[PDB]
Symmetry: D2
């Protein structure tokens, strides 16, 4: 494929363009609620993922070409307690048949299987596990729950976060930024990532999130909108 | 969904974005060959269809809104004999789980089942069946192999045909045009079509084609490229 | 330039993106009224033109490349008398400094100067002059008020006409279609046009219209919206 | 206007889409060289600006609506000496008739006139003047050479910088990021900026740059490509 694009200003309650996995659902107001909410309150031990229906052609073995892509999405992570939060939300790419992996700190993306899984993620990590830096962080993750690069992230409870992720194929640069319009505060991180080596030719793209494994480490992970475009020169 | 787009300047030999049904395949040079070719020669009794992976949201029961869409594709129909041709090629919309229907003059789109099937097609018909006008034609077909409107079509054997189809939701106008750049000859037809009444909320879009049911009524039906865009106001 | 696009769903009353020439104005409801209207009634001897502010790079002498482009616009031509009409409306390309040429049957586009002017137009001609066929027509015009190709055009008084014009650089094919959603009636014409030979490298694009030179040959020429895109491979 | 877009993968040597002011020129290889280079070496006391030909409709007094916009551009600033650099490069919006203002630290954008000029800029400042913080910085500037917000910027001599600027009208958030693909290092800054209050309804957008006012404070300021899109809801 050469060019694929799609833009949701909000999500449809029974989405056919979006493959919902685990606890993910679209609320009737059109928020993509990745992790469970009960009586308006986030629940623990939740794992939800959402992928776009069409696979994306990110590289081609015949032509040796790599896709470029850009995506925008806004998301909210709201926790009943500012200091106890887990586990986070991520935008990711994985093989098209990708299924939910471990919950909790593995973010539904990775596992501890000793079989290195193919998934490239931009995580917004709200809990410091063994493999994390100390502070909440935006991480670029290449086939590991351990980020290859991260920036410390001043998570704002319940505030809309605007994210813009792009991948420039000609330089192998993956760049992720987050901005909180509420107080015009922003964070960015970039990495040199070889998508040909990390991922298969075709992938599915989307989001994954998990709530903490305890009652006092719960938060929501809602996506409010999403735009994506990818071009493969071919 | 609000906006979905995709553009192929040619097709990938093992397409993941394109669901190939019946005899459809992508050749190694990237043509979408809907009907069978053997030793470079079209074969009879063939039926092939290709659909885009992502369903398209063409209308919404809650918001009462209808999508607009536009698509461009180029296609070749080549017959070893100018005067004996069958059966044709079509661009269509159908429920997402749509499967190949009858072969031959039914174009893989419709059947004679007495169970009116949901499919809206723009056919390029190369054989005059019982339900057709006399001459080869471009037809707009709403849940029937019988066109509600058609224009006579001067098919050019083996020449590239450029098609542009659009649907204007605000007026319910479906317009289909074909141009042969080789001699700058063009045909157009339009119809007032209520997609809400003809189709379910979500559909898949693509192409369907069949070769004749006899050895002396064979032709190819190759699509060379394809661009599509649909917006649902919501 | 490689890609230029712009889309108006209606026009701004004091447009800065649109260079208005002669009698052209934008009404407060956002219609581009090319020719004069007085007390709601079309006036004779009027000439109005509108061009997009940015020049469009349609070909390049260094790279030998030609642009492709596509444009959509809706327009109304309303005459107080169905049988007496003049003169018409056109979409055109001309050098960027292009100024209004002759009025009346020259459509503000051409003149009788014996100095062949550079302008390539798709005219919707409502009056049969000396150089016209008999019937109202959609014409493709290459540096002459005389069309190189035309299709007879069933003008519908006061009805919205939807036009789609495209130019495919790889085949030099200019295609123009018009559809009246009101009764789903359509017309199309195509021509092999060498834009490199007809036009300079850079042009401005837009509309031109004139009302008849007599009181009993008056009509309006309003454009309701306009989308344009052009890509030059370079 | 509702939607305006344009994308250059490089610039044309005699650009008609781009209004070049002061010393700005396009090199024969298609770089937009804002400030003077002599025998391949940057010259002092230079000031160059480039604007897109079409004005952009950023807000509308009648409808009370504000545009959103996004733009990407890559740029190089190369100095013969790493530690002596001046003055910088900026992306800006200003009234359409905007002309070059003061040189040097005023970046061709502002002056010391005591007549507050309308210009909103995202500067990449390479020299600490009286109104600057100490370190080189990316600044958001609203009708002043003094930034309202800035982030410290690790300028990389002679390296390609990729910038992405967006403005979200619904939150009044202007966000600017820079990434050096060479070592995947990134910077971002955001501000709450009211474009209705800072700028007139229509503007022109582009770049401005100046070299230092001394021989030992020289650098280049070349833009390599540029994409822009703006939508005004209206
Ligand atoms: Ca963690
Ligand atoms: Ca038939
Ligand atoms: Ca005439
Ligand atoms: Ca400075
Ligand atoms: Mn982490
Ligand atoms: Mn038929
Ligand atoms: Mn004529
Ligand atoms: Mn500064």
């Amino acid at each position: 494929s050469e060019v694929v694009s799609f833009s949701f200003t909000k999500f449809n309650p029974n989405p056919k363009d979006i493959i919902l996995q685990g606890d993910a659902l679209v609320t009737s107001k059109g928020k993509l609620q990745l992790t469970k909410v009960k009586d308006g309150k986030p629940v623990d031990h939740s794992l939800g993922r959402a992928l776009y229906a069409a696979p994306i052609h990110i590289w081609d073995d015949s032509t040796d070409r790599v896709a470029s892509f850009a995506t925008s999405f806004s998301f909210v992570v709201e926790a009943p307690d500012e200091s106890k939060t887990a586990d986070g939300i991520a935008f990711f790419l994985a093989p098209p048949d990708t299924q939910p992996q471990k919950d909790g700190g593995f973010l539904g993306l990775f596992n501890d299987s000793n079989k290195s899984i193919q998934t490239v993620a931009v995580e917004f990590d709200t809990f410091s596990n063994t493999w994390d830096p100390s502070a909440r962080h935006i991480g670029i993750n290449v086939n590991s729950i351990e980020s290859m690069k991260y920036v410390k992230w001043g998570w704002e409870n319940g505030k809309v976060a605007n994210v813009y992720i792009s991948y420039e194929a000609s330089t192998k640069t993956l760049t992720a930024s987050l901005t909180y319009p509420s107080n015009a505060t922003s964070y960015i991180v970039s990495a040199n990532v070889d998508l040909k080596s990390a991922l298969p030719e075709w992938v599915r793209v989307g989001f994954s999130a998990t709530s903490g494994l305890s009652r006092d480490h719960v938060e929501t992970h809602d996506v409010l909108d999403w735009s994506f475009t990818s071009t493969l020169q071919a």
